[PDB]
Design a binder for this molecule. Structure first.
Ligand SMILES: C[C@@H](C(=O)N(C)C)N(CC(F)(F)F)c1ccc(C#N)c(C(F)(F)F)c1
Ligand SMILES: C[C@@H](C(=O)N(C)C)N(CC(F)(F)F)c1ccc(C#N)c(C(F)(F)F)c1
Lengths: 250, 250
């Protein structure tokens, strides 16, 4: 009815609750980091499955699909963390998973605490802007499509048409509430700017990840296989700036 | 004729360093890279010893000395490779060590021809500019002091004074041969522009290094102790541009 079919479809393909499988009996640095990595493994599997039902995605060359997933993995994860924190704990806690909800107390380490403060920016903006699920779902797809190789994608044409249709869908999502043209136009600017700023934010997560990855044995932190492959295959390249981040505003 | 500081810099240069490569067997990706890392471990140890005799260095906070060595090791190594190739084999071969010399055919047959060509650029530049030993010595010190943390060093004032001292010394080295205010002025520009450019070239070596490090077990490429220490300590941060490369030109 009032809800555009594409948005309803996106709602229906959202993943079910994902647990970190964290141990609540026995916590610590490596323990917390290991659980977060376990959660990361389950999240990656979720994004891949999700991408198989995302209208238009399966039509892109297979290599582009793999590349886009790996490129956006961290971004989609932190964005999802932002949504969950916003929806379950009014953004006042980091809701990584039902069995892994972190607050100030569980962030003893200055390095980890700083990282969390950075992630906290998303939930906070979600609360400030009062993002709707309709808007979040469309923004999530745009995130998936927010970075491309320097030489571009193999299915570049199809990629741009897809990005455009989801940009039009984000506008429709905004139209659901923001009825005014001036207000709806200003809201489009705010949401797309939030997406632009994610590049800077995620860079910090990428670096923290790679550093912990390299010192995994010494830090006693386990990194599951699927995620390990994403980190080994693209993070060094991404941190070195060997990719093309897409921006809505120059 | 030769200024005292330059004479001292020449007296503290390390002796010849061997890679310990077994040239009795045909090259393999794993054996060449492993010997390069072994040579690397030895070069690193040589740099530490040298820094201990380098005027001004020992007076910087101990943490700063460590940071500077970890930030510049790759730069110092490739620069050294450039000098050695230029002096021993007219710059027409990569003279890593007396027991590890690669002419172009050996480069083409390695699994990293492209990397070899990148490294080979330095020696060729030395041939083109006819860099003197006096200029080379001062330039090498500046490379050690060519990158600082975003927040700066603990002994920042002292660092700034030491760096300025060696820049003044480079100027003296140039004056040892360059005559005419203009040509000597242009020479300072060229050599400092060369140093600025090294940042770009070193970035390619840093990525190749990190990728190989991450995949060390699969590729059978061993990374010695101190070598692994500096890589895990700063490589990801450096690649992500979370440090301040110093530039002579805007
Ligand atoms: C990849 C993993 C890691 O490398 N660790 C060292 C724990 N880590 C990234 C880091 F940068 F935060 F550390 C994350 C793991 C799971 C989730 C979720 N959900 C998230 C986030 F996106 F929500 F922040 C991040
Ligand atoms: C660090 C090491 C490495 O990580 N390997 C995978 C071998 N490697 C860097 C690479 F990028 F070339 F691979 C080097 C090792 C020794 C030397 C010398 N001398 C040099 C250089 F100075 F010539 F560039 C580079």
């Amino acid at each position: 009815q009032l809800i555009p079919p594409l948005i309803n479809l996106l709602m229906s393909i959202e993943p079910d609750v994902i647990y970190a499988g964290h141990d609540n009996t026995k916590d610590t640095s490596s323990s917390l980091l290991t659980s977060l990595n376990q959660l990361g493994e389950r999240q990656l599997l979720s994004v891949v499955k999700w991408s198989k039902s995302l209208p238009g995605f399966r039509n892109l060359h297979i290599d582009d699909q793999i590349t886009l997933i790996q490129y956006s993995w961290m971004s989609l994860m932190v964005f999802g963390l932002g949504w969950r924190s916003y929806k379950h704990v009014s953004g006042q806690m980091l809701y990584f998973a039902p069995d892994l909800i972190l607050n100030e107390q569980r962030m003893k380490e200055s390095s980890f605490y700083s990282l969390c403060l950075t992630m906290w920016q998303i939930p906070q903006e979600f609360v400030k802007l009062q993002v709707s699920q309709e808007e979040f779902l469309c923004m999530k797809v745009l995130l998936l499509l927010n970075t491309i190789p320097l030489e571009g994608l193999r299915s570049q044409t199809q990629f741009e048409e897809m990005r455009s249709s989801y940009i039009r869908e984000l506008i429709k999502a905004i139209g659901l509430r923001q009825k005014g043209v001036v207000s709806s136009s200003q809201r489009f600017y705010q949401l797309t700017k939030l997406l632009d700023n994610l590049h800077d934010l995620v860079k910090q997560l990428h670096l923290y990840c790679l550093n912990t990855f390299i010192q995994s044995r010494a830090l006693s932190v386990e990194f599951p296989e699927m995620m390990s492959e994403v980190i080994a295959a693209q993070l060094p390249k991404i941190l070195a700036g060997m990719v093309k981040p897409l921006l809505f505003h120059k």
